[PDB]
Amino acid sequence: GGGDVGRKLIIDQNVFIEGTLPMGVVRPLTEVEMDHYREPFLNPVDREPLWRFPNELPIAGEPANIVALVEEYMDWLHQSPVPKLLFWGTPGVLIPPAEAARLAKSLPNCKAVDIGPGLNLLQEDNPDLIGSEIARWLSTLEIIGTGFPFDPHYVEVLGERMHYVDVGPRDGTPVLFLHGNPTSSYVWRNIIPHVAPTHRCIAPDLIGMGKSDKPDLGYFFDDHVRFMDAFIEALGLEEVVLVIHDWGSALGFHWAKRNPERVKGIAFMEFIRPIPTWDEWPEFARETFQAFRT
Ligand SMILES: [Cl-]
Incomplete structure:
Protein backbone atom coordinates (compact mmCIF):
# COMPACT_ATOMS: atom_id res chain seq x y z
CA GLY A 1 0.00 0.00 0.00
CA GLY A 2 0.82 3.69 -0.21
CA GLY A 3 3.79 4.65 1.91
CA ASP A 4 5.15 1.12 2.44
CA VAL A 5 8.21 1.54 0.20
CA GLY A 6 9.29 4.90 1.57
CA ARG A 7 8.62 3.95 5.20
CA LYS A 8 10.67 0.76 4.87
CA LEU A 9 13.59 2.91 3.69
CA ILE A 10 13.32 5.81 6.12
CA ILE A 11 11.66 4.30 9.21
CA ASP A 12 12.92 0.74 9.17
CA GLN A 13 16.31 1.08 7.49
CA ASN A 14 17.10 4.65 8.60
CA VAL A 15 18.17 5.59 5.06
CA PHE A 16 17.73 9.33 5.54
CA ILE A 17 20.41 9.27 8.25
CA GLU A 18 22.66 6.47 7.01
CA GLY A 19 22.54 7.34 3.29
CA THR A 20 20.81 10.57 2.37
CA LEU A 21 22.60 12.70 4.96
CA PRO A 22 26.01 11.77 3.42
CA MET A 23 24.49 12.47 -0.01
CA GLY A 24 23.97 16.04 1.22
CA VAL A 25 27.61 16.75 2.17
CA VAL A 26 30.48 17.07 -0.30
CA ARG A 27 33.17 16.17 2.25
CA PRO A 28 33.02 12.91 4.25
CA LEU A 29 31.29 13.29 7.61
CA THR A 30 33.35 11.83 10.44
CA GLU A 31 32.06 9.01 12.63
CA VAL A 32 31.66 11.49 15.51
CA GLU A 33 29.55 13.76 13.30
CA MET A 34 27.44 10.83 12.09
CA ASP A 35 26.81 9.82 15.69
CA HIS A 36 25.61 13.34 16.57
CA TYR A 37 23.18 13.18 13.65
CA ARG A 38 22.09 9.62 14.56
CA GLU A 39 21.41 10.32 18.23
CA PRO A 40 17.76 11.53 18.00
CA PHE A 41 16.73 8.61 15.82
CA LEU A 42 18.12 5.47 17.47
CA ASN A 43 14.55 4.23 17.97
CA PRO A 44 12.75 3.59 14.63
CA VAL A 45 9.39 4.95 15.86
CA ASP A 46 11.07 8.31 16.38
CA ARG A 47 11.84 8.56 12.65
CA GLU A 48 8.40 9.87 11.60
CA PRO A 49 9.64 13.45 10.88
CA LEU A 50 12.38 12.07 8.63
CA TRP A 51 9.74 10.38 6.45
CA ARG A 52 6.99 12.97 6.53
CA PHE A 53 9.32 15.78 5.44
CA PRO A 54 10.22 14.37 1.98
CA ASN A 55 6.52 13.57 1.55
CA GLU A 56 5.79 17.28 2.15
CA LEU A 57 8.29 18.56 -0.43
CA PRO A 58 6.53 20.59 -3.17
CA ILE A 59 7.38 18.43 -6.18
CA ALA A 60 5.30 18.13 -9.35
CA GLY A 61 2.44 20.03 -7.75
CA GLU A 62 1.97 17.86 -4.66
CA PRO A 63 1.08 18.20 -1.89
CA ALA A 64 -0.96 21.09 -3.28
CA ASN A 65 -1.27 22.83 0.08
CA ILE A 66 2.53 22.99 0.51
CA VAL A 67 3.00 24.14 -3.09
CA ALA A 68 0.59 27.02 -2.46
CA LEU A 69 2.21 27.99 0.86
CA VAL A 70 5.68 27.99 -0.71
CA GLU A 71 4.53 29.96 -3.75
CA GLU A 72 3.03 32.51 -1.35
CA TYR A 73 6.23 33.01 0.64
CA MET A 74 8.31 33.19 -2.53
CA ASP A 75 6.03 35.90 -3.86
CA TRP A 76 6.42 37.64 -0.49
CA LEU A 77 10.20 37.38 -0.72
CA HIS A 78 10.20 38.87 -4.23
CA GLN A 79 8.20 41.91 -3.03
CA SER A 80 10.08 42.48 0.23
CA PRO A 81 12.85 45.06 0.62
CA VAL A 82 14.32 43.12 3.56
CA PRO A 83 18.10 42.54 3.39
CA LYS A 84 18.83 39.08 1.98
CA LEU A 85 21.98 36.93 1.94
CA LEU A 86 21.85 33.80 -0.25
CA PHE A 87 24.52 31.09 0.03
CA TRP A 88 24.79 28.50 -2.71
CA GLY A 89 27.12 25.74 -3.88
CA THR A 90 27.75 23.54 -6.89
CA PRO A 91 25.82 21.42 -7.79
CA GLY A 92 23.43 21.97 -4.89
CA VAL A 93 20.38 19.79 -4.26
CA LEU A 94 17.33 21.98 -3.65
CA ILE A 95 18.86 24.99 -5.44
CA PRO A 96 20.87 24.55 -8.67
CA PRO A 97 23.46 27.25 -9.38
CA ALA A 98 21.42 28.80 -12.21
CA GLU A 99 18.46 29.23 -9.85
CA ALA A 100 20.62 30.74 -7.13
CA ALA A 101 22.04 33.20 -9.64
CA ARG A 102 18.63 34.13 -10.99
CA LEU A 103 17.19 34.69 -7.51
CA ALA A 104 20.21 36.79 -6.57
CA LYS A 105 19.26 39.09 -9.45
CA SER A 106 15.47 39.03 -9.03
CA LEU A 107 15.03 39.23 -5.26
CA PRO A 108 15.30 42.79 -3.91
CA ASN A 109 18.31 43.70 -1.79
CA CYS A 110 20.02 40.32 -2.14
CA LYS A 111 23.72 39.46 -1.92
CA ALA A 112 24.73 35.98 -3.04
CA VAL A 113 27.80 34.04 -1.91
CA ASP A 114 29.30 31.01 -3.67
CA ILE A 115 30.58 28.56 -1.07
CA GLY A 116 32.30 26.32 -3.62
CA PRO A 117 31.35 22.65 -3.97
CA GLY A 118 28.17 21.96 -2.04
CA LEU A 119 25.12 19.72 -1.98
CA ASN A 120 22.50 20.31 0.74
CA LEU A 121 24.29 20.84 4.10
CA LEU A 122 26.38 23.78 2.90
CA GLN A 123 27.24 24.51 6.54
CA GLU A 124 29.26 21.29 6.64
CA ASP A 125 31.32 22.13 3.55
CA ASN A 126 32.19 25.80 4.15
CA PRO A 127 31.22 26.91 7.68
CA ASP A 128 33.90 29.54 7.89
CA LEU A 129 32.76 31.40 4.79
CA ILE A 130 29.10 31.14 5.75
CA GLY A 131 29.71 32.24 9.33
CA SER A 132 32.15 35.02 8.50
CA GLU A 133 29.90 36.39 5.76
CA ILE A 134 26.85 36.31 8.04
CA ALA A 135 28.82 38.20 10.69
CA ARG A 136 29.94 40.85 8.20
CA TRP A 137 26.42 41.20 6.80
CA LEU A 138 24.90 41.57 10.28
CA SER A 139 27.28 44.44 10.92
CA THR A 140 25.59 46.29 7.96
CA LEU A 141 21.97 45.86 9.10
CA GLU A 142 19.94 48.62 10.75
CA ILE A 143 19.34 46.67 13.97
CA ILE A 144 35.85 21.67 11.02
CA GLY A 145 34.71 21.19 14.61
CA THR A 146 32.83 18.06 15.62
CA GLY A 147 31.86 19.06 19.15
CA PHE A 148 28.71 20.76 20.37
CA PRO A 149 30.00 22.87 23.28
CA PHE A 150 26.81 24.73 24.08
CA ASP A 151 24.95 25.04 27.34
CA PRO A 152 21.56 23.34 27.04
CA HIS A 153 18.40 25.40 27.03
CA TYR A 154 14.87 24.08 27.17
CA VAL A 155 11.49 25.80 26.97
CA GLU A 156 7.95 24.47 27.29
CA VAL A 157 6.06 25.00 24.03
CA LEU A 158 2.42 23.93 23.79
CA GLY A 159 3.10 21.43 26.56
CA GLU A 160 6.21 19.93 24.91
CA ARG A 161 9.80 20.61 25.84
CA MET A 162 11.96 22.08 23.06
CA HIS A 163 15.75 22.25 23.13
CA TYR A 164 17.73 25.18 21.76
CA VAL A 165 21.13 26.80 21.71
CA ASP A 166 21.11 30.33 23.17
CA VAL A 167 24.46 32.13 23.27
CA GLY A 168 25.62 35.71 23.01
CA PRO A 169 24.41 39.01 24.44
CA ARG A 170 20.81 39.85 25.40
CA ASP A 171 20.95 43.54 24.53
CA GLY A 172 20.47 43.49 20.76
CA THR A 173 18.48 41.93 17.95
CA PRO A 174 18.76 38.12 18.07
CA VAL A 175 19.66 35.83 15.19
CA LEU A 176 17.36 32.79 14.86
CA PHE A 177 18.92 29.76 13.11
CA LEU A 178 16.45 27.17 11.71
CA HIS A 179 17.63 23.71 10.61
CA GLY A 180 15.82 21.25 8.35
CA ASN A 181 15.72 17.53 7.55
CA PRO A 182 17.42 15.35 8.91
CA THR A 183 19.54 17.70 11.02
CA SER A 184 19.26 19.64 14.30
CA SER A 185 20.90 22.70 15.80
CA TYR A 186 24.11 20.64 15.45
CA VAL A 187 24.23 21.78 11.80
CA TRP A 188 24.86 25.35 13.01
CA ARG A 189 27.64 24.48 15.48
CA ASN A 190 30.47 25.96 13.39
CA ILE A 191 28.46 28.95 12.14
CA ILE A 192 27.27 30.25 15.54
CA PRO A 193 30.80 31.03 16.87
CA HIS A 194 31.30 33.62 14.11
CA VAL A 195 28.10 35.44 15.12
CA ALA A 196 27.90 35.03 18.92
CA PRO A 197 30.64 37.64 19.63
CA THR A 198 28.31 40.40 18.36
CA HIS A 199 24.76 38.95 18.34
CA ARG A 200 22.61 36.53 20.31
CA CYS A 201 22.29 33.21 18.48
CA ILE A 202 19.17 31.12 19.06
CA ALA A 203 19.09 27.69 17.37
CA PRO A 204 16.11 25.47 18.22
CA ASP A 205 15.72 21.79 17.53
CA LEU A 206 12.48 21.32 15.60
CA ILE A 207 9.76 19.37 17.38
CA GLY A 208 10.50 15.65 17.13
CA MET A 209 14.13 16.37 16.26
CA GLY A 210 17.43 16.90 18.02
CA LYS A 211 16.97 17.06 21.80
CA SER A 212 13.38 18.34 21.56
CA ASP A 213 10.48 16.22 22.75
CA LYS A 214 8.87 13.62 20.49
CA PRO A 215 5.08 13.93 20.72
CA ASP A 216 2.78 11.62 18.77
CA LEU A 217 2.25 13.85 15.74
CA GLY A 218 2.20 13.23 12.02
CA TYR A 219 5.05 15.78 11.74
CA PHE A 220 3.42 17.54 8.83
CA PHE A 221 4.70 21.01 8.01
CA ASP A 222 1.62 22.32 9.88
CA ASP A 223 2.99 20.75 13.08
CA HIS A 224 6.37 22.41 12.63
CA VAL A 225 4.74 25.76 11.89
CA LYS A 257 5.47 36.53 5.36
CA ARG A 258 3.13 36.48 8.37
CA ASN A 259 5.30 38.75 10.56
CA PRO A 260 7.10 41.03 8.11
CA GLU A 261 7.64 43.91 10.53
CA ARG A 262 9.60 41.58 12.81
CA VAL A 263 12.14 40.36 10.25
CA LYS A 264 15.22 42.59 9.85
CA GLY A 265 17.23 40.31 7.54
CA ILE A 266 17.17 36.81 6.06
CA ALA A 267 20.23 34.69 5.31
CA PHE A 268 19.23 31.50 3.53
CA MET A 269 20.69 28.51 1.76
CA GLU A 270 19.51 25.29 0.12
CA PHE A 271 15.95 26.43 0.66
CA ILE A 272 12.50 25.11 -0.24
CA ARG A 273 10.96 26.37 -3.48
CA PRO A 274 8.44 24.61 -5.73
CA ILE A 275 10.06 21.93 -7.90
CA PRO A 276 7.78 21.86 -10.95
CA THR A 277 8.82 18.44 -12.31
CA TRP A 278 10.99 15.50 -11.26
CA ASP A 279 13.43 16.58 -14.00
CA GLU A 280 14.28 19.60 -11.80
CA TRP A 281 15.33 17.26 -8.95
CA PRO A 282 18.98 16.10 -9.29
CA GLU A 283 19.38 12.76 -11.04
CA PHE A 284 21.70 11.31 -8.35
CA ALA A 285 18.84 11.83 -5.84
CA ARG A 286 15.78 11.27 -8.04
CA GLU A 287 15.11 7.56 -7.59
CA THR A 288 15.77 7.95 -3.86
CA PHE A 289 13.26 10.76 -3.32
CA GLN A 290 10.71 9.12 -5.62
CA ALA A 291 10.97 5.96 -3.46
CA PHE A 292 10.65 8.02 -0.28
CA ARG A 293 7.29 9.26 -1.64
CA THR A 294 6.04 5.78 -2.64
CL1 LIG B 1 13.12 16.37 3.10
Whole structure:
Protein backbone atom coordinates (compact mmCIF):
# COMPACT_ATOMS: atom_id res chain seq x y z
CA GLY A 1 0.00 0.00 0.00
CA GLY A 2 0.82 3.69 -0.21
CA GLY A 3 3.79 4.65 1.91
CA ASP A 4 5.15 1.12 2.44
CA VAL A 5 8.21 1.54 0.20
CA GLY A 6 9.29 4.90 1.57
CA ARG A 7 8.62 3.95 5.20
CA LYS A 8 10.67 0.76 4.87
CA LEU A 9 13.59 2.91 3.69
CA ILE A 10 13.32 5.81 6.12
CA ILE A 11 11.66 4.30 9.21
CA ASP A 12 12.92 0.74 9.17
CA GLN A 13 16.31 1.08 7.49
CA ASN A 14 17.10 4.65 8.60
CA VAL A 15 18.17 5.59 5.06
CA PHE A 16 17.73 9.33 5.54
CA ILE A 17 20.41 9.27 8.25
CA GLU A 18 22.66 6.47 7.01
CA GLY A 19 22.54 7.34 3.29
CA THR A 20 20.81 10.57 2.37
CA LEU A 21 22.60 12.70 4.96
CA PRO A 22 26.01 11.77 3.42
CA MET A 23 24.49 12.47 -0.01
CA GLY A 24 23.97 16.04 1.22
CA VAL A 25 27.61 16.75 2.17
CA VAL A 26 30.48 17.07 -0.30
CA ARG A 27 33.17 16.17 2.25
CA PRO A 28 33.02 12.91 4.25
CA LEU A 29 31.29 13.29 7.61
CA THR A 30 33.35 11.83 10.44
CA GLU A 31 32.06 9.01 12.63
CA VAL A 32 31.66 11.49 15.51
CA GLU A 33 29.55 13.76 13.30
CA MET A 34 27.44 10.83 12.09
CA ASP A 35 26.81 9.82 15.69
CA HIS A 36 25.61 13.34 16.57
CA TYR A 37 23.18 13.18 13.65
CA ARG A 38 22.09 9.62 14.56
CA GLU A 39 21.41 10.32 18.23
CA PRO A 40 17.76 11.53 18.00
CA PHE A 41 16.73 8.61 15.82
CA LEU A 42 18.12 5.47 17.47
CA ASN A 43 14.55 4.23 17.97
CA PRO A 44 12.75 3.59 14.63
CA VAL A 45 9.39 4.95 15.86
CA ASP A 46 11.07 8.31 16.38
CA ARG A 47 11.84 8.56 12.65
CA GLU A 48 8.40 9.87 11.60
CA PRO A 49 9.64 13.45 10.88
CA LEU A 50 12.38 12.07 8.63
CA TRP A 51 9.74 10.38 6.45
CA ARG A 52 6.99 12.97 6.53
CA PHE A 53 9.32 15.78 5.44
CA PRO A 54 10.22 14.37 1.98
CA ASN A 55 6.52 13.57 1.55
CA GLU A 56 5.79 17.28 2.15
CA LEU A 57 8.29 18.56 -0.43
CA PRO A 58 6.53 20.59 -3.17
CA ILE A 59 7.38 18.43 -6.18
CA ALA A 60 5.30 18.13 -9.35
CA GLY A 61 2.44 20.03 -7.75
CA GLU A 62 1.97 17.86 -4.66
CA PRO A 63 1.08 18.20 -1.89
CA ALA A 64 -0.96 21.09 -3.28
CA ASN A 65 -1.27 22.83 0.08
CA ILE A 66 2.53 22.99 0.51
CA VAL A 67 3.00 24.14 -3.09
CA ALA A 68 0.59 27.02 -2.46
CA LEU A 69 2.21 27.99 0.86
CA VAL A 70 5.68 27.99 -0.71
CA GLU A 71 4.53 29.96 -3.75
CA GLU A 72 3.03 32.51 -1.35
CA TYR A 73 6.23 33.01 0.64
CA MET A 74 8.31 33.19 -2.53
CA ASP A 75 6.03 35.90 -3.86
CA TRP A 76 6.42 37.64 -0.49
CA LEU A 77 10.20 37.38 -0.72
CA HIS A 78 10.20 38.87 -4.23
CA GLN A 79 8.20 41.91 -3.03
CA SER A 80 10.08 42.48 0.23
CA PRO A 81 12.85 45.06 0.62
CA VAL A 82 14.32 43.12 3.56
CA PRO A 83 18.10 42.54 3.39
CA LYS A 84 18.83 39.08 1.98
CA LEU A 85 21.98 36.93 1.94
CA LEU A 86 21.85 33.80 -0.25
CA PHE A 87 24.52 31.09 0.03
CA TRP A 88 24.79 28.50 -2.71
CA GLY A 89 27.12 25.74 -3.88
CA THR A 90 27.75 23.54 -6.89
CA PRO A 91 25.82 21.42 -7.79
CA GLY A 92 23.43 21.97 -4.89
CA VAL A 93 20.38 19.79 -4.26
CA LEU A 94 17.33 21.98 -3.65
CA ILE A 95 18.86 24.99 -5.44
CA PRO A 96 20.87 24.55 -8.67
CA PRO A 97 23.46 27.25 -9.38
CA ALA A 98 21.42 28.80 -12.21
CA GLU A 99 18.46 29.23 -9.85
CA ALA A 100 20.62 30.74 -7.13
CA ALA A 101 22.04 33.20 -9.64
CA ARG A 102 18.63 34.13 -10.99
CA LEU A 103 17.19 34.69 -7.51
CA ALA A 104 20.21 36.79 -6.57
CA LYS A 105 19.26 39.09 -9.45
CA SER A 106 15.47 39.03 -9.03
CA LEU A 107 15.03 39.23 -5.26
CA PRO A 108 15.30 42.79 -3.91
CA ASN A 109 18.31 43.70 -1.79
CA CYS A 110 20.02 40.32 -2.14
CA LYS A 111 23.72 39.46 -1.92
CA ALA A 112 24.73 35.98 -3.04
CA VAL A 113 27.80 34.04 -1.91
CA ASP A 114 29.30 31.01 -3.67
CA ILE A 115 30.58 28.56 -1.07
CA GLY A 116 32.30 26.32 -3.62
CA PRO A 117 31.35 22.65 -3.97
CA GLY A 118 28.17 21.96 -2.04
CA LEU A 119 25.12 19.72 -1.98
CA ASN A 120 22.50 20.31 0.74
CA LEU A 121 24.29 20.84 4.10
CA LEU A 122 26.38 23.78 2.90
CA GLN A 123 27.24 24.51 6.54
CA GLU A 124 29.26 21.29 6.64
CA ASP A 125 31.32 22.13 3.55
CA ASN A 126 32.19 25.80 4.15
CA PRO A 127 31.22 26.91 7.68
CA ASP A 128 33.90 29.54 7.89
CA LEU A 129 32.76 31.40 4.79
CA ILE A 130 29.10 31.14 5.75
CA GLY A 131 29.71 32.24 9.33
CA SER A 132 32.15 35.02 8.50
CA GLU A 133 29.90 36.39 5.76
CA ILE A 134 26.85 36.31 8.04
CA ALA A 135 28.82 38.20 10.69
CA ARG A 136 29.94 40.85 8.20
CA TRP A 137 26.42 41.20 6.80
CA LEU A 138 24.90 41.57 10.28
CA SER A 139 27.28 44.44 10.92
CA THR A 140 25.59 46.29 7.96
CA LEU A 141 21.97 45.86 9.10
CA GLU A 142 19.94 48.62 10.75
CA ILE A 143 19.34 46.67 13.97
CA ILE A 144 35.85 21.67 11.02
CA GLY A 145 34.71 21.19 14.61
CA THR A 146 32.83 18.06 15.62
CA GLY A 147 31.86 19.06 19.15
CA PHE A 148 28.71 20.76 20.37
CA PRO A 149 30.00 22.87 23.28
CA PHE A 150 26.81 24.73 24.08
CA ASP A 151 24.95 25.04 27.34
CA PRO A 152 21.56 23.34 27.04
CA HIS A 153 18.40 25.40 27.03
CA TYR A 154 14.87 24.08 27.17
CA VAL A 155 11.49 25.80 26.97
CA GLU A 156 7.95 24.47 27.29
CA VAL A 157 6.06 25.00 24.03
CA LEU A 158 2.42 23.93 23.79
CA GLY A 159 3.10 21.43 26.56
CA GLU A 160 6.21 19.93 24.91
CA ARG A 161 9.80 20.61 25.84
CA MET A 162 11.96 22.08 23.06
CA HIS A 163 15.75 22.25 23.13
CA TYR A 164 17.73 25.18 21.76
CA VAL A 165 21.13 26.80 21.71
CA ASP A 166 21.11 30.33 23.17
CA VAL A 167 24.46 32.13 23.27
CA GLY A 168 25.62 35.71 23.01
CA PRO A 169 24.41 39.01 24.44
CA ARG A 170 20.81 39.85 25.40
CA ASP A 171 20.95 43.54 24.53
CA GLY A 172 20.47 43.49 20.76
CA THR A 173 18.48 41.93 17.95
CA PRO A 174 18.76 38.12 18.07
CA VAL A 175 19.66 35.83 15.19
CA LEU A 176 17.36 32.79 14.86
CA PHE A 177 18.92 29.76 13.11
CA LEU A 178 16.45 27.17 11.71
CA HIS A 179 17.63 23.71 10.61
CA GLY A 180 15.82 21.25 8.35
CA ASN A 181 15.72 17.53 7.55
CA PRO A 182 17.42 15.35 8.91
CA THR A 183 19.54 17.70 11.02
CA SER A 184 19.26 19.64 14.30
CA SER A 185 20.90 22.70 15.80
CA TYR A 186 24.11 20.64 15.45
CA VAL A 187 24.23 21.78 11.80
CA TRP A 188 24.86 25.35 13.01
CA ARG A 189 27.64 24.48 15.48
CA ASN A 190 30.47 25.96 13.39
CA ILE A 191 28.46 28.95 12.14
CA ILE A 192 27.27 30.25 15.54
CA PRO A 193 30.80 31.03 16.87
CA HIS A 194 31.30 33.62 14.11
CA VAL A 195 28.10 35.44 15.12
CA ALA A 196 27.90 35.03 18.92
CA PRO A 197 30.64 37.64 19.63
CA THR A 198 28.31 40.40 18.36
CA HIS A 199 24.76 38.95 18.34
CA ARG A 200 22.61 36.53 20.31
CA CYS A 201 22.29 33.21 18.48
CA ILE A 202 19.17 31.12 19.06
CA ALA A 203 19.09 27.69 17.37
CA PRO A 204 16.11 25.47 18.22
CA ASP A 205 15.72 21.79 17.53
CA LEU A 206 12.48 21.32 15.60
CA ILE A 207 9.76 19.37 17.38
CA GLY A 208 10.50 15.65 17.13
CA MET A 209 14.13 16.37 16.26
CA GLY A 210 17.43 16.90 18.02
CA LYS A 211 16.97 17.06 21.80
CA SER A 212 13.38 18.34 21.56
CA ASP A 213 10.48 16.22 22.75
CA LYS A 214 8.87 13.62 20.49
CA PRO A 215 5.08 13.93 20.72
CA ASP A 216 2.78 11.62 18.77
CA LEU A 217 2.25 13.85 15.74
CA GLY A 218 2.20 13.23 12.02
CA TYR A 219 5.05 15.78 11.74
CA PHE A 220 3.42 17.54 8.83
CA PHE A 221 4.70 21.01 8.01
CA ASP A 222 1.62 22.32 9.88
CA ASP A 223 2.99 20.75 13.08
CA HIS A 224 6.37 22.41 12.63
CA VAL A 225 4.74 25.76 11.89
CA ARG A 226 2.66 25.56 15.04
CA PHE A 227 5.55 24.60 17.31
CA MET A 228 8.02 27.08 15.83
CA ASP A 229 5.51 29.95 16.06
CA ALA A 230 4.98 29.02 19.71
CA PHE A 231 8.73 28.63 20.37
CA ILE A 232 9.35 32.17 19.13
CA GLU A 233 6.58 33.52 21.34
CA ALA A 234 7.76 31.49 24.37
CA LEU A 235 11.14 33.24 24.08
CA GLY A 236 9.38 36.62 23.88
CA LEU A 237 11.14 37.48 20.65
CA GLU A 238 10.16 40.74 18.99
CA GLU A 239 12.29 41.51 15.92
CA VAL A 240 14.80 38.97 14.63
CA VAL A 241 17.29 38.20 11.90
CA LEU A 242 16.67 34.77 10.32
CA VAL A 243 19.36 32.29 9.21
CA ILE A 244 17.54 29.40 7.58
CA HIS A 245 18.13 26.17 5.67
CA ASP A 246 16.12 23.35 4.05
CA TRP A 247 12.80 22.82 5.87
CA GLY A 248 13.93 25.53 8.30
CA SER A 249 13.77 27.92 5.37
CA ALA A 250 10.13 27.05 4.73
CA LEU A 251 9.47 27.80 8.41
CA GLY A 252 11.44 31.04 8.31
CA PHE A 253 10.01 32.40 5.07
CA HIS A 254 6.46 31.47 6.08
CA TRP A 255 6.96 33.18 9.45
CA ALA A 256 8.44 36.26 7.75
CA LYS A 257 5.47 36.53 5.36
CA ARG A 258 3.13 36.48 8.37
CA ASN A 259 5.30 38.75 10.56
CA PRO A 260 7.10 41.03 8.11
CA GLU A 261 7.64 43.91 10.53
CA ARG A 262 9.60 41.58 12.81
CA VAL A 263 12.14 40.36 10.25
CA LYS A 264 15.22 42.59 9.85
CA GLY A 265 17.23 40.31 7.54
CA ILE A 266 17.17 36.81 6.06
CA ALA A 267 20.23 34.69 5.31
CA PHE A 268 19.23 31.50 3.53
CA MET A 269 20.69 28.51 1.76
CA GLU A 270 19.51 25.29 0.12
CA PHE A 271 15.95 26.43 0.66
CA ILE A 272 12.50 25.11 -0.24
CA ARG A 273 10.96 26.37 -3.48
CA PRO A 274 8.44 24.61 -5.73
CA ILE A 275 10.06 21.93 -7.90
CA PRO A 276 7.78 21.86 -10.95
CA THR A 277 8.82 18.44 -12.31
CA TRP A 278 10.99 15.50 -11.26
CA ASP A 279 13.43 16.58 -14.00
CA GLU A 280 14.28 19.60 -11.80
CA TRP A 281 15.33 17.26 -8.95
CA PRO A 282 18.98 16.10 -9.29
CA GLU A 283 19.38 12.76 -11.04
CA PHE A 284 21.70 11.31 -8.35
CA ALA A 285 18.84 11.83 -5.84
CA ARG A 286 15.78 11.27 -8.04
CA GLU A 287 15.11 7.56 -7.59
CA THR A 288 15.77 7.95 -3.86
CA PHE A 289 13.26 10.76 -3.32
CA GLN A 290 10.71 9.12 -5.62
CA ALA A 291 10.97 5.96 -3.46
CA PHE A 292 10.65 8.02 -0.28
CA ARG A 293 7.29 9.26 -1.64
CA THR A 294 6.04 5.78 -2.64
CL1 LIG B 1 13.12 16.37 3.10
